[model samples]
Structure formats: structure tokens, C-alpha cells
Target: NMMWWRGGVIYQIYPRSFLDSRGDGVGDLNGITEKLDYVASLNVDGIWLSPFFTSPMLDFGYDVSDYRDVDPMFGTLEDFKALLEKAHSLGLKVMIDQVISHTSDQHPWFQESRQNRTNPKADWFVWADPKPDGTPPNNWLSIFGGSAWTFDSRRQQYYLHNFLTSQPDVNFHHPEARQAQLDNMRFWLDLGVDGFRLDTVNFYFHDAELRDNPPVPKGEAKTLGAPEANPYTWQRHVYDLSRPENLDFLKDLRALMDEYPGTTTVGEIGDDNPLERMAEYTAGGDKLHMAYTFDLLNMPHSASYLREVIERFQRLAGDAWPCWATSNHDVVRSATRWGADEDPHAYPKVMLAVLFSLRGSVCLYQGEELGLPEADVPFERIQDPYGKVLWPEFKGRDGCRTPMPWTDGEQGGFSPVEPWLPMEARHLELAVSRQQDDPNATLNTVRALLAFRRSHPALFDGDLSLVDVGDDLLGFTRQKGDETLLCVFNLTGQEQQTTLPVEVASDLPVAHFTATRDGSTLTLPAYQAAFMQVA
Candidate 1:
């Protein structure tokens, strides 16, 4: 029953742009199968492949139609199974994205549920009778835009959808629906897939009464990348999704996962109040193995803010193991989003060292090792509907999700032909082969640092205690059993030194980070990060 997922590194591979095998210009399972050695060379424990399941791909595979089979666009079921076998042979576990919160409107379940209110599968998806005026049942809003409910003429009701209308939310409240989804999961587990990255894990249920959500207070309505013009940020969303009933569903999911060996589940928490939700969702062993939220991924460039996030999680849910990521397929890349200095490459590598030194499992976004900034896609090149709906202001996630740069060849060696998402000009210069020879290159640093982490057990599942924070300096101690390690970082672009109080100075040992200590004071070079062990 021991799972090695906690405190491990999971590399994310976005299928559409990872590598193309069929000359169709879209990355596929066979493409990934060919790149197993490259992925394994990064020293990551597993690969978290983004949704490649059957779909219309309106949301680029997030709107899943078939949970158990691979989409033809990506590959066949046999190709995926072969890819899994290849990854395992390289000692890398394969974790697929599980989009259980919703299904494509084209799915059989949704088709049957929307046919008639009295159909055998009528209650399989969330459905509610329209108001007397025939408006949606309540004030639920989609994450992409307006109302969360779309009218269904045949069913004479409105069905719930947290994202695009094409993706209808599943009714976990129904027993049969829950079993159906579990059976789908069992199908995957039987095929030897290691685990799942549960997309929107908190969005499994809604208030059955269909109550209007309360208006969010001005102070509480912080939008995370949603354009200010979009009204999705206007409400607190107290009713539409993330209900208390979701916990029982999670228990069911955990029980289903327990049936298999070496299977792990990391739930993506999309709530605004993520730390509290992370704590609640992962409080007991019967829920998710590890849950990650948008706390660090959405923050501005400041070490203090990072400290606040880590400290909050440490204080609130010390017992609940967690996972973290600086960049992913969803958000802006860290090199572009957070720059400690004007040099984009400098801070991203330091950020990785800081991330690996932290006490939790880590998810490393692809191409981050080369310090790739967010790629720029012109208006004509944009494929995301949400971005097109709110363009020329805040570009959508398509920028960060461009094709991976494998070498200096055309298409950055990602594909021999044109890619689904064009390769970025700068990313070509930072290609993996270009950096492979440089001893101090960010990619090499990442490999060395991850190897260092793999050799240290305390850094992975240790108890985290903050040593100090102030004057652009942050330090912490990670403890496991009799071993302790000290991590220190300069959170600013300028050099800083702070004289420690008498008690804080006496607590230090000469073995841990001795170079930074000058008597009772620590002198930190600009943007420096140091990890050291102490008895």
C-alpha cells in the first residue's frame, strides 16, 4: 500500500504540443513513447500527461467524452498502453489526467440524460427544472463566463456546467452515476496506469436546492487571471459547486483507488480559498493522497507572498501531505510571471531549487528546466475560445502551452512538421540540446538538484519550520527523525543582511549553511538559495 507519490516530482506533458508522431502536427501517445528517455533523464519520478482521452477537444481535451479510451487525435487505446509500458520501463510512472467532474455533451451519458426527464438515465447528470420564467435555476456562473446552467429543450430543464456548456457536470449524488465513473477508473487502473491528476477535484457536487450564490465582497473578489470585464469574478460561488457532499464522493473514490497497488491521486483544488479547502479535502487518509491548489501558481513575484502561502499551509494542515507547482499548462509561465530581477532565466532556476527544497511533492511544468518564458501567440494564431472571447487584453493559457523545444531543429525538434501550437522564437534558443552541454545551464542545475533531492529523504516528507523571514530574506528548517536541513534564500534582487537576535543566533549550527553566517548575522547574495544538512 506504500505509494512513492508523496514528495516526488511529476513532469507534466501536454499532449497536443508535446511531440507529434503521425505528421498530423499534433503530439500523440507514440510521440511520447519515443521521448521516454528524454523525460526520464530529467530525474522526475512520474509523468502527469494532460487529458488525452476521447474528446471533441473544444477545450483542448479538458472536455472529456470517454474517460477510459485514448482519443484518436492522440492515439488508440493500444498506443496509450504501450506508452505506459514504455514509461514504466524507464522507471517513470505514468499519471493520466482524470476529468471526472464533467463529461462532453456528446458523451452517451449526457446524451441519454438530456433526452427526457423520465429517461432511465435522466438523473445521471445535474439537471434542474427551469424557473417559472424559464430562466436558469440559479445564479451559478461558469468559470469561462456566464451562467453555469444551459437549457435542455428535450429534458425541459437546465443542466449544470462549471466550464464550457459543452461539458456538463456529472451528478455524483446519484449512486449509479458514481459506480459508472468508478468502473471507468477501474478500467484504467487495470491497464497499469500509475495514478490520476484529478482535474477540478473540488467541483464534484452542488447544492440540490439551486440557491443563488451570494455576491462576493470587493475585498474577497480577487480574480486569478480572469479578465476584469468577465463577470465570473462577481460572485462567491457558494452554491453551484464544491459542496460538503463532495467529501463522501471522495471517500468512494479513495476506496476505489485502494483496490489497486501503487496507485496515487492528486486532486486539483480550484477554490479561491485553496489552503482551507486543501486542508479539508486531504484531512483524512480516505480522501486524496495529495491535493494542490492555485496558491503559489497565482501569486505575484515576491518572496514574502511565497512565505505567507507556505506558512499558512504548514500551520493549517501540517498533517496533510501536499504538492506544489510554479507553472503548469493552465497559468502563465513563472519566468514571465515572476521575475525577481530583469533577467528571466536567473530567477526561474532559483525558484526550482526553492521548490525542490520545500517539504512536499512537486509538479514540474515541461520546458521549465530551460527557463522558457510564456510564449506569445498572435490573435490570428489563438485557438482557445475563452481567449478569443477576451482577447487583446489578457491572453489565455495557450501561450504557456506551446510545443516543447526538443532541439535546435525546425519546430524546435518537437515535430518534423508544423506543430499544432507554433514554436516560440525564444524557446528555440533555449532548446534542450542547446543547454545540454553547459555545465551551469538551468537544465543541468535542475537535474543535479532533483538528484540531490532524491538522495535526501528529509526534504521530501520532513516537518517544515520557518527559521526567519524579513528584509528580503527567508529560511527554514526541514526535520525528519534525527536529521535536520536548513534552507536559506534571498528573496530580492539586492543584497541584504539582518542581525539575528541572541536566541536565534545561538540556535544555529556551523554545519548548516556556514558560508552565509558571519558571527550572529547572515549575509545573503542577491537571489541566492542554499540547502545544507545539520545534525
Candidate 2:
């Protein structure tokens, strides 16, 4: 039998905001357990949880203090075990986050390491001696701001932190450090969880030489995920991350996971050249099951843009499976990013169709099935640190991280208490209870499309070929022997038309098509797409 994660749809749940059963305004494992029926109804193969381990919530749960235990904010370890049991009973696999690349400064290892240079855990974290003048070891900017190194007065040495200074980078070069991280993985796998999502997969190792990164050329700066205003985008980042030594570390990780049956891993590759890094990371099966880049989540809505991303991936990373998504807790919703000319609702539907039909495994953010738009927050009410840092310029991910609206009642039915982020006007109107009765609702359509994908192997395991491409039209054919599906999409505001040549054969019929194609002329309205089986 094929591995379940290959060509499967994995629903990602940002636990804190998904559902809160305790009315604490924060979601928990029990809350997710209560919603499994809703999740199972969508027919996803597995669910990937973001960090739920012990943390201080400095940068949310990304700064993990204890890897083996569940944070009390979410619940106890038994709660997580119960969640896994419930998911497995429902035929859904469970994958939890593994923040191996870094740890919260409050972690025991870090605390011990901060004591002295020759201590047992002293080398567990990346550290370097300050310059003679008492400055940081090198010039490296953090994603949040300022230098990547944070000086510890106790040890009198600087430790590395790529994002928030509270999250210090782990020293994967040390055998004990690497093994301790793997032991945590073993603990979860031993508890019946399926796999993990490795956070900052490529950030595990740094250049040992501490050589400063050379300045990047002018045009190269725009390619990385870093925003223009953020100084982190200005450097080449050669010494800070993406080191060649990290490959062996991944090999060790994969070896431990290979012992389990049907266990899988998906790495999150954050680099200036993510496509190339993704190719390198997944080229050998010993590295990771698959790795995802920021490409889909960061792009604007355009058929041609998406077609280019797919075609480019084929050119750059041939035969390597990819996972595609349009939005997540880390980015803005596609509805807000990809504004349409005609109808507000139409673009989101078209976007969803395109997302479901993309040529890889899919990740649907929570509440996206309800066709939820980005939430609007007043300046006083904003809760995201990134949003607070950038203020009016960049709002960060608070808009998409708002609570999931279950009803249109008070608090938009997400909670009996006040939500962490206030539910917006549009989200209140698009609650799940209101949409459950409507046959044409986007939520139901998503459910049907997910089920439709589950029933057809051609939708997932088939080969994808770009058949036709024009300024406004993108046509691709996905075939699995006897089954051939033709997908035609219009990438613009104006209508786009295409004609089928006799050599290409007559078009086949399908009521499941999202857009209309009549006679010899295939007309796609603005932001529209259609998919059907063809001979």
C-alpha cells in the first residue's frame, strides 16, 4: 500500500485559535477532539497541529521549553493522547509540530548551557565568544529585528537566535543535543502519534567558521521571504543558516522515524532559495517525507502565477512531491490578498477550486472551508507581536488568526467568552451553523470537493501536464491511464476564451465542472476555473 501522506490532503490546525471548549478564548486539544466530526466530514487524511508543547507564548508556541510534555495552556499529555486516539479511531492520522531547530531560552538545556563553557549542556546551543570590544560575534539580523545573537551575562558568550531572541538556535553538531531532540520525537511516536512537522527545517545548523555573510546583489534581495522594510532581507544569509552540514542531521531524524509504520514528516524550508533548498532536502528519501516552501502562501491570486510556480517547481525539483496551500496562520487570507473586480464571494470560490485542484497534497487552513474573509482589528485590540512591531504598515497574521466562527450569535459563536482576536463582520455572517443548511454554501462545496478527491486516485496520484498556456488561459491535463481530467482556468478579470483543435480531441462532459465550457469555445469568466474528465 502507498504511504498515506503521499498525495494526501493534510488539514493544518493552529491549535490556539481553532476552537476553545473552556471559554478561555484559546483553543485546546479537547476542543479539537470535539470538532473531529466536522474535520472527518471533510475526509482529510491527517491533521497537522502547530506547536502545542510547553512554552511561554513569547512567539506563541514556536519557542518550545519542553518537548516531551504538553503545555498546561492547551492541556495535559493525557489530553493529547486522547486526541490522538480519537483521530486514529476516526481514520485520521495525527502529526504534531517539532521545533528541533530552536528552543525557548527557559528550556533546561539552555539554562544549564548558560552557566559556563565546559559544563555538560554548555554546547547544547549555538554560542560564540564576543569580539574583543564586547560586540556580537558577527553581523546577522534576526527576522524580528536587531542582531541574531543574544549575549548571556552568566556565560559571557553570545547565543544564536534567528527569529525571536527568546528562541535560541540548538547546536545539532553536538551528539547529545541532536539525540535529545530525537528522543522527544520518539516519545511522541511511542504515544501513537503518526509524525511531525519540523519547524525551520533548514535552520538546524549554522556555519562553524562564523564568517560574515557577503552582501547580496541588488535584485537578489526581493526574492527572499523577508519584507522590504525588515533589515533581515538585506543580507545573503550564507553563514547564518542553510549550511551543508545540516544534511546529516536530517538523515539521523529520518532513520528514527523509519522504524515506525506509516509515520511521515513534512519539513518547513525557510531560505532565500527555498525551491532549490526544497529539492536538496527531499532529493534523498533519507532526509524528509516532503518539504513545503512559502511560495503558495505568499503569492497573490493569479492563474498564470500559480501555473508558473508549478511549472517552475517541475523544472527545478522534478518528481519531488510538494504540498500546496494559499493561506495559513502565518499569512493573510487569499480573499484579502487576491481582490476580485466583480463579486467578493466569487473570487474566494474560484480560489478554493484552484487550491483543491493544484498538483500536490493540500493544506486547508482552519475556518477557510467556511469561505471566511480576513478579520479586521482595531489598533487597540491587535494581539500579534509582529503586528505591533510594524503598526499601520504591516498588520502581520492577526487578520487570518482570528477565532473560528461557529455561529452568528454573540462572540460570533466561537466562544461564550471574548475571543483572543475579535471576530470580524464578514466572519460572523459566514458562520458554520448558518452555512450548514445551504447546499450551495462554500463550506459544503469544500466538503464535497474533498470527498470527491478522496474517491478519485487520478485527483491525487495522477501525472500532471501543462497542456496549453496563453496570456490569460492556463490548461493542464492530469491522467491516470483510463482517467484523464482537463483543467482550464482564467487568470484575469476579463473573460478568457480557448478553442479545442481537432488534434486535441473533443472535450468530454462533466456537471462537476466549476466553470462552463460550451461547444468548441471554452469561456472562463474572471477568476474562474473548470475541471472535468476527458477522453
Candidate 3:
């Protein structure tokens, strides 16, 4: 049997903001449990929960204080048991975030390590003696800002933190430290979770030599994910992350996962050459079950750009599977990033079609189904530290990290009280409650497309090949056994015409976005797409 996640769609729930059943105004496991029917209604294979682990919330649970326990804000471990029970009973799988690459500085391991050089957990985190001038060991800029290393006077040593200083990078170079991470994964697998979404999969190891990264050559700096004002993009990023030593640890991770059949892992990769890294980490099939890169989440999308990214990964990733997502907690919503100039309503629907029809498994972020645009969080209201440091130049990710709007009613009905992050008033019109009853709502489009994908065997686990129909268009074919599907997308505001790439028996009703075809000619209206079965 094909593993369920192979070509399945996983709806991502940023737990802090998905829904709040608690009067305290933050989403909890119970809240997600409350919404399992809605998730199952979308025909999604599963749900990927963003970090709900015990944390200080410095990076909002990405900086985990306890990998084995649920945070009190999200509810107790018993509450998670209830959530898991309902999810499985609804025929949905559950995947939790595993942020083992770093830990909240308050973690017992970090606290023990910070005490002295010879202590048991002292080497658990990356640490180095400062240069004689008291500067960091080498020039490694944090994605958040400034130096990647922060000095801990308690240990009188500088420790590495790729994102925030309060979140210390764990040293996977230590054998026991690596084993402890595997142990943590086993804990969740035993609890019946179907998989894990590995946070910063490439950041597991740093160069032991502590080498400085070379500057990004002039032209390529404009092509990166970080904004130009953020120096984090200025470096080639070879040594700070995506290390060679990390692959073995992944093999170890996969080994543990194998013990629990059907459980899987999807890695979040970021690097100078993430397409290559995504392929390598998932290649050989024994490493990661699949992995995703920041490519789609960060790039400006276009017909050619979309084709190139998919074709590139397909070319490089042999015997490897990949998971694709256009938006998440860490990036701007694709609705605004990719469609700010188009009819806001029409373009988001087109995007949902394109993402679902792609060759890989899909990660549909929580509000994407509602066609939620990126919320505008004011400077004073911004809670993201990354946004605070890079403000004015590049507002951090709070725009995409805001609460999920459930209603057009007061406070977005996300909470009874004002929650942690303000829910933009603009999102109320696109709220889940508002869209649920609208037949043509983007929410319904997602449901229809997901249902279509689940029913089509070729689109499910088939091999994908690029089809060159014309410019301003993205085309591909998916084939499995005797079935073949021809898919084409119009990525422009103007209607696009092209010859049918193949003989289509009839149009496949994938979603609301459908193209008109007469004989050999295909006509795709503004921001529309077509899915057709081969004659």
C-alpha cells in the first residue's frame, strides 16, 4: 500500500492562532480537537501542528523548553491525548512540530550546560571561546539580526543560535545529544502521532571549525529570501548550516521512524542551495520521508518561475520525495505576496489550484483555505522579534502569523478577549464562519480540489513531467499505471491560449478553476487552470 503521506495534503494549524476554546484566548489542543470535523471536511489526509511544545514563546514554541511535554498554554499532555484520539477517530493523521535543532535557553539541558565547561550537558549546545578581542568566534549573522553567537557569562563562552539568542542551537556532534532527540521522537510515535514536521532540518549541525561564510556575490543577493536590509542574506551560508554531518543524524531519525510503520517526517530546509539540499536530505529514502524548502514560501511566483522550481527539484531529487507549501507561519501569505496586484478574490483561488495540482504532497496553511490575505500588523502591535529588529525595512512574519479568523463578528470570534496577536479586521470578511456557507468560497474550492485529488490515482502518487504549452503558462503531466492527467495553469491577468499539450478525453473537475477546451485548442481565462484526463 502507498504510505498515506506520499501524495496527501496536510493542513497546517499554527496552534497559537488556529482557534481558542479556552477563555484565556490562545488556541489549545482542545480547540484543534473542536475543529477536526472541519479539517476532515476538507478531505485532507492529516494536520501538521506548529510547535505546541513546552516553550518560553520567545520564537513562539520554535524555541522549545521541553520536547516531550505540551505547553500549558496549549494544554496538558492529557489534552493532547484527547486531541490525538479524536483526530485518528475522524480518519485524520496528526503530525507535530519537532524543533530539536535548538532549545529555549530555559531548558534544563541548556541550564545545566550553561553552568560550566566540564558539566554533563556542557557540550550539548554549540559553544566556543571568544576571540582574544572578545568578539564572536567567527562572523556568523543571525537570521534575526547581528551575531549568531551570544556570550553567556555564566559559562564565559559564546554559544551559537541561528535565529534568536534565547534559542540555543543544539550540538548534534554530541552522540548523547543526538540520541536524546531520537528518544523524543519515539515518545510521540508511541503516542500515535502519524508524523513530525522537523523545524530547521538543515540547521541541525554547524561547522565544527567555525569558519566565516563568504559574501553573497553582488547579483545573487537580490535573489535570496531575507530582505536586502537584512545582512543575513549577504552571506553564502555554507558553513553556518546545511552541514554534511547532519545527514547521519537524519538516518538515525529515520531508523526510529521505521520501527513505527506508517509514521513519517518532513524536514524544513533553508540554505543557499536548498533545492540541492532538499534532494540530498530526502535522497536514498532512508533519510527524511520528504522535505520542503523556502523556495515557494519566499519566491515571487510566475509561470516560468513556478515551472523552473518544480522541474529543478524533479531533476535533482531522484528516489526522493518532497512536500511543498506556499505559505506558513514563517513567511508572508502567498495571497498578498503573489497576488497583491490582481483581483484579491480571484487570484487566491487560482493559487490554491496550482498548489494542489503540483507534483508533491501539499501543506495547506490554516487560513489559505479562506483566501486570507496577509494581515497588516502595526509596529506597536507586532509581536515577532524578527519583525522588531528588521522593522521598516522588512516587517517580520507577524503578518502571516496572526490569529485565524473564525467569524465576521467581534474580535474576529477567534477569541472572547483580545488574543496574543491582533486579528486584522480585514480578515473578518474572509473568516471561516463566513466562507463555510458560501458555495463558491475559496474554502469550498479547497474542499473540492482535495476531494478530486483523493479520487484520482494519477494525481495522487504518479510520476510528473513538465509540458511546454507556452509562455505565461505552467504545464505538467501526471501519470500512474494506465491513467494520465494533463494540467496547465495561466499565471497572468490576461487570458492565455495554447494548444492542448495532449489529447484530453475531458476536463477533470479538480476545482472551480477550469479552462475551456475546443478540439486541440485550450483557452484559460485570467488566473485559471485545467486538469484533464488523457484520451
Candidate 4:
């Protein structure tokens, strides 16, 4: 069976910002459980929760100190179990973030590994002797902007950390460490979780020989690398990550997930050539069931660019599924990123319609339904370490990770006290309570479009073929059995005219479009979109 996740919409919730049930200013598992009704109302198939495992909150929950326990800030293990139960009861599959590539330096395993060369867990983490001059072994740069290696005084060696120094990379080279990670995943799988969103899936293995990554060709394109001012993009990242050995671990992980029927895995591939790696990781049945990358998550929002990414994945991934998202916790919200900051509702409505019309499963960032733009977090108030390091050059991800605005209250109805990140005035203006009264609000538009999608099999799991329209227009056709729909989008801020292809000319137009169609001639207003059924 292809299963529910093969072609489903996932609503990603950053727990810390979703809702705070305890009024402690931070969100908890109970907070999410309380919001399941609202989540299920959106018609998304599942909720992808960002990391909430035990951590010191240095890199948020990504730096896992104990994978089997819940951080007291989020809640106890029982709270998570109740959340899982509530989510499942609402017919919503729950997929949690699994940050297996690394763990907090405070983790017992890492602590033991760092104690000395002869400890039992010494090989559990990636440790290497410094070069004769005491410099780092190689020139692999961290994605967060520094040498990937961090010196460990106790071990007298440098340990690899792809992100923050507090998060040390696990040594997949050690069979026991790999097995232990798998066993840790089994703990959650047995706990009734539907699946996992494998964070940094391709970073599980590094070059065994500690080879230096070569430089990217000057003209080569960068996907979601560090900001232009950051030097993390200077290298090609061949040896630092996306190692061939990772494919086998994916298979092992898949095997574990397979034991739990109805469970699925979606790996987040962030490589130099993510599409190519996504294909490799999900190609065989033994690997991940689906994979997503930073292709659409980054700055590119043009129609042609979107079409290229989809078509390229379809060509490379074959039967493997692709999960697409325009906005998430990592990047700026599409409302602001796509130049819709002025008229949020209208633009986001069009974007959501287009997103749901695409061939594969879609992922929605938490505040996306409310047309929330990126919050302008001040440097003094920024909580993101990544943002703090780069200062004015790069403000970091705190903007997108701010508390979700549920109401127009000073706290945005998220908490009774000050939130970890302050809610933006713009976000409060579009809060859920404000729009809940308006039928034409962005939230309702999201509901309507998703309902429309649920009613059409062609939009869910169907063959997708890009229709040739001018640069100003993007068009596609989705067909399954006798059902077929021609979806078109106007990707600009001005009205555009186009002639429908011969096959679509005779099609019956749907009422969703803001454009006018008379026979083959059509007029598309700014950001207008349409769905037409094949005659």
C-alpha cells in the first residue's frame, strides 16, 4: 500500500511557538494536544512536530541530550503520550522530528565518549586527533558558520559538529553507535508515533578518511546555503556530508519503520544536489518513503523555478514520493518572502491554491494558514544562536519561529506571559480570532482550498504534466483515471493574457479562478489562479 503519507498534506508545528497550555511563556505537549481540533479542522493528513526531545535548548530541541525523554519545558513523557493519543483520535497522523545526526554534548553517550580514548562510548561520537600543529583536521565548515570541528579538552581531539558546537555529530562508523540510534528510534515507534521527519537525513555519515571538501565552481548555483555574506557556501561539501554510507543506514531505518505498519519516513535532504540525493535515498522500497529538500523552502518563488524543481524531482525520484513546502521553521514565511507582505490574504490564498494543486504532498508551516509574515525580531530580543552569531548580516530563523498568533491579545493568545519570541504587530493583525469571523480571511481560504483538494482525487495522487504557458503564467495538468484538472497560475503582480492549449480549450472552468475565460482566450488578474476539469 502507498499509505496516507505518500500523498498527504503535513502541517508543521514548532511546539515552542504553537501554544503554551501552562502559561509559562513556552509551549508544551499539552499545548499541542489542546490545539489538535484546530489542526484537524485544516484537513491536513498529519502534523510534523519539530524537535521536543530532552535538550538544554541551546539549538532548541535539535540538540538532543536524551532521545527517550521529553524536556520538562515541553512536558513530561506522559504529556507527549497524551498528545499522540489526542492527535491519533482526531485521525491525524503524528510525525516527530528525529535529529539522529547529532546529539547534545551533554548527552550521557557523548559525555562518556568525550571522557577519554578508552571509554566504552569513546567511539560513539566522531572524534579525531588534531593535526600536528593542533589545527582542525580538515576545512569542512559548519552550516551555522564556523569550522565543523570543535576541540574537546578531555579527549584531546576535535569532534565534528555540523551545526552548533553543543551538538556533536554521532559516529556512524561505529556499528554499536548506529544500532543504538536505531534502538532509540524504536522507542518512539513503539510509543505509537506514526512516523518521523528525519532531520539532516543525509548527514548520518561523513567521509571516513576525513577528506577536505572541494570548492564549489564559481558559477555553480547554491540551494539553501548560508547567507551571501557567510562563507559556508565556499566549499562543495562533498566529503563533509551526503556520504554514500548514509544510504545503508536509511535502509536500516526503513526496516525499523516497516516493522510498524502504516508508519512512514520522510527524510530532509540538504545537500549540494538535493534532488539527486533525494532520488537515491527514496528510490528503493527499503529506504525512505518520501523526501523533501530546501528547493522550494529557500528564496526562489518564481513559476518557472517551481516548475523546474518539480519536474527535476519527478525525473530523478521516479516512484519515490516528494514532499513540497514553501515555508517552514527554517526559512522566511512565503507571505513576506514572495512579496505579499502588503496584501497577505489575497496572495497567500493564491499561493495555497497553487501549492495544493501541485503533484505531490504539501507541507504548511504553522502560521501560514493565518497569512503570518516573518516577524521582525530585534537583535536584542533574538533568541536564535545562529542569528546572534551573524548579527546584522543575518538575522537568523527567529523571525519565523515566533509564537503563533491565535488572537489579537498582547500575547497573541499563545501564552499568559511573554512568549519566548515576541509576536509581531503584523501577525496579531491577522490573528486567528480576527479572521475566524471573516469568511474571506486567509484561514478560511486555506480551509476551502484544502476541502476542494480533498474532494478531487486528481489533486491528491495523479500524474502531473507541466503545461506550456508564457513566463508570466505557470500551468499543469493532474489526471487519475477519468478525473483530470488543468491548474494554471498567474505569477505576477499585473494582469496577464494567454491562450489555452487545444486540449484545455474545451475544458469546463471551475469557480475558484479570479480570471475570466471565454473559449480559448483568458485574462488572469494579478496572482489569479484556476482549476478546470477536462471535458
- The candidate that wins on lDDT is 3
Runs with alpha carbons beyond 4 Å of true place in candidate 3: none
Q: How close is candidate 2 to the true structure, as a TM-score?
A: 0.95
Clashes of 2: 0
Worst 10 residues of 3 by lDDT: 219-228
Residue 255 of model 1 has an lDDT of 94
Tens-digit lDDT track of model 3 for 1-535: 3398888899999999988888677888888898899999998999999999999898988999899999999999999999999999999989999999999999999999999999999899999999999999999989899899999898789999998999999999999999999898899999999999999898899999999998878866442457778888888888998888898888899899999999889999887788888889989978999888878986579888988887788778578888989989988898988888887887888888888888778899999888888999988888889898966988988999888888899778878988888988889989889899898889998888888887889888798888889868988899999999998888778899999767889887666676898988999999887888888
Model 4 Cα lDDT, one tens digit per residue, 342-440: 355578878888888887778899989888888999878899888977789888999999998889987889999988889888888898889886877
By TM-score: ranked, best first: 3, 4, 2, 1
TM-score of each: 0.95, 0.95, 0.98, 0.97
Question: On a 0 to 100 scale, what is the lDDT of residue 296 in model 4?
Answer: 76
Model-by-model lDDT, in order? 0.81, 0.80, 0.88, 0.86
Ranking by lDDT: 3, 4, 1, 2
Candidate 4 residue spans exceeding 4 A from truth:
340-342, 502-512
Better of 1 and 3 by TM-score: 3
Model 1 gets an lDDT of 0.81
| Displacement of the residue 38 alpha carbon in candidate 2, Å | 0.5
